[PDB]
Amino acid sequence: QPFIVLGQEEYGEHHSSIMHCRVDCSGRRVASLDVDGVIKVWSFNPIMQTKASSISKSPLLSLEWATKRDRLLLLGSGVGTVRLYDTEAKKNLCEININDNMPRILSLACSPNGASFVCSAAAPSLTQVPGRLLLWDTKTMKQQLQFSLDPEPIAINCTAFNHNGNLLVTGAADGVIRLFDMQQHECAMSWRAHYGEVYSVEFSYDENTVYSIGEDGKFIQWNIHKSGLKVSEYSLPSDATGPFVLSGYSGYKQVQVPRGRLFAFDSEGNYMLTCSATGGVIYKLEKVLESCLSLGGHRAPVVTVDWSTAMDCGTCLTASMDGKIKLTTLLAH
Q1: Contacts of 175 (CB under 8 A, 6+ apart)
Q2: How far apart are CA 77 and CA 46, in angstroms?
Q3: What Gene Ontology cellular component terms go with this record?
Q4: Which helix (H) or strand (E) holds 203?
């Protein structure tokens, strides 16, 4: 038992399936976005209370806290825009126009230095559809750079920066991981990672590996020094990667393919939180992966997770297709 469960609480202000649930960098505020385009910004310390609420006219596909401007939220739309939402002033400051031809903003990564963001802009979902990867200067609100996607423009699903923000790891709909240097058009490194789409990518705590989870239901650790050398590979339970299904009393059913983060890590990247039908499942990061804590508490499939720390106190977020978000407080033992 590596964690003491201090308690579990439930945020129920969403009445639709959750797409995204992210704690801000201070560990004090949650931004949650559902499939109906409702954003809730809420605190859980000292009590659970909504601070802000907005209803999108447009579909929203991605959600990312700004790094320099605390209380600023980036929202990627399905109409080729990025919204800067001031959570304190409780209004949109501006809508940045990314691309009309590739209007699905599937991913946003804010540079740690706060001077720029990378966004994925993909063509409408027909089938393996083309996409762009773009660097934006936050100050001028102008595109700086378009990255080279070899061998063909493809939809980028997921992005993560290293600590410095000079390296960006990416997963695409073609199952390829591309590692970009921020001062280079062409990527430093790429390899076939998954059969089908890459859903989530992350740098290890020590930044010697990247972790990926994909449509083949595999969790893989890649050596970033040895392009496509696997360090570890695991078949997770199917309910870790979906598709996520909630059937109603008449057989009218809701089907959700992963969009939000499918995994999250504790502060030192020793443990990983994952989705399951009934709640969060945590694994210790020899040759096969074994679950060490099951958070439970959900009556509908968990589709996205987050793990934050504040005041030496871990907070696990598990979000389900009924719109329920469970908050589980962990103290390390």
Answers
A1: 192, 193, 194, 195, 196, 197, 198, 214, 215, 216
A2: 32
A3: cytosol; early endosome membrane; endosome membrane; late endosome membrane
A4: strand 198-203
Residue 47 token pair: 């009590």
Find how far residue 9's CA is from the centre of its chain.
22
**Determination method here?**
X-ray
For the four alpha carbons of 136, 33, 274 and 246, in that order, the dihedral sign comes to: negative
For residues 309 and 267, the answer to whether their CB atoms sit within 8 Å is yes
Is residue 19 within 8 Å of residue 60, measured between CB atoms? yes
Residue 52: CB partners within 8 Å, gap ≥ 6? 39, 40, 41, 87, 90
Say whether 116 sits in a helix, a strand or coil: strand
Helix (H) or strand (E) segment spanning residue 173: none
> Which parts of 35-155 are beta strand (E)?
38-43, 49-55, 60-65, 72-77, 81-86, 91-97, 104-110, 116-122, 131-137, 142-146
DSSP 226-293: TTT-EEEEEE--GGGT--EEEE-TTS-EEEE---S-SEEE-TTSSEEEE--TTS-EEEE---S--EEE
CA 302 to chain centre: 14
Q: Which two tokens stand for residue 164?
A: 């410095």
Q: Which two tokens stand for residue 138?
A: 């936050």
The helix (run of H) or strand (run of E) holding residue 100 is none
* Residue in this structure with the two tokens 């809701």, named with its chain if needed: 254
Q: Are 119 and 83 in contact (CB under 8 A)?
A: no
In the chain, residues preceding a discontinuity (C to N beyond 2.5 A) are 127, 285
Query: Is 192:154 a contact under the CB 8 Å cutoff?
Result: no
**Cis previous bond, 151, omega within 30:** yes
Cis bond upstream, residue 59 (ω within 30): no
User: Amino acid identity, residue 56?
Assistant: S
Sign of CA dihedral 199, 203, 7, 292: positive
Q: What was the resolution (in A) of this experimentally determined structure? A: 2.1
